[PDB]
Amino acid sequence: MNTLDFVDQASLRDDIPTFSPGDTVNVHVKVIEGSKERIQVFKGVVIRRQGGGISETFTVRKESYGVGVERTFPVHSPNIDHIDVLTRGDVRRAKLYYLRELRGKKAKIKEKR
């Protein structure tokens, strides 16, 4: 029952959608550049999710100009102000590390039907 869950309760966040590894999402992140706050979008497949409660993280994978980029966030991080789930994928794994050696038409993931 997570002996410290009476401390982690206050810092949890609502309105996180219900996503699973294999789903395609775009994550709205806040960046600071000379005290001017703006927002950037990272769009890619979700390849893992390491549950721990308040300390849960997930990883998003993208290909940018022929170079792949992985970006990992905490689920309840205040920086992530918005998550939109775009597609639900068909996977037989809980962690999709096998995508790391696949490029192009070989890295496409089926979707729920």
Partner 1 sequence: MIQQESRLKVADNTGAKEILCIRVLGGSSRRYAGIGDVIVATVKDAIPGGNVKRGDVVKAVVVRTVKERRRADGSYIKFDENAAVIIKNDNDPRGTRIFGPVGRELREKKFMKIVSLAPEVL
Partner 2 sequence: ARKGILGTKLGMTQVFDENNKVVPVTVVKAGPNVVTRIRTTERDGYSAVQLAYGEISPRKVIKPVAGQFAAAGVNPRRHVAELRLDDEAAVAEYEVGQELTAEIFSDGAYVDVTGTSKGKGFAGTMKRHGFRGQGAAHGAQAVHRRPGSIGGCATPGRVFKGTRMSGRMGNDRVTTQNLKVHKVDAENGVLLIKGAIPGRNGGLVVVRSAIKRG
65 binds partner 1 (CB under 8 A): yes
The DSSP element (H or E) to which 61 belongs, if any, is strand 57-64
Q: Which of 22, 44 has the CB closer to partner 1? A: 44
Among positions 17-36, residues that touch partner 1 (CB under 8 A) are 31, 33
Q: Which of 20, 72 has the CB closer to partner 1? A: 72
**Shortest separation between residue 79's beta carbon and partner 1, angstroms:** 5
Per residue, what are the HEC states of 15-56?
Answer: CCCCCCCCCEEEEEEEEEECCEEEEEEEEEEEEEEECCCCCC
Tell me if residue 84 falls in helix, strand or coil. strand
**Shortest separation between residue 111's beta carbon and RNA, angstroms:** 12
Separation of alpha carbons 58 and 20, rounded Å: 9
Selected from 20, 50, 55, 72, the binder of partner 2 by CB under 8 A is 55
Q: Which of 76, 88 has the CB closer to partner 2? A: 76
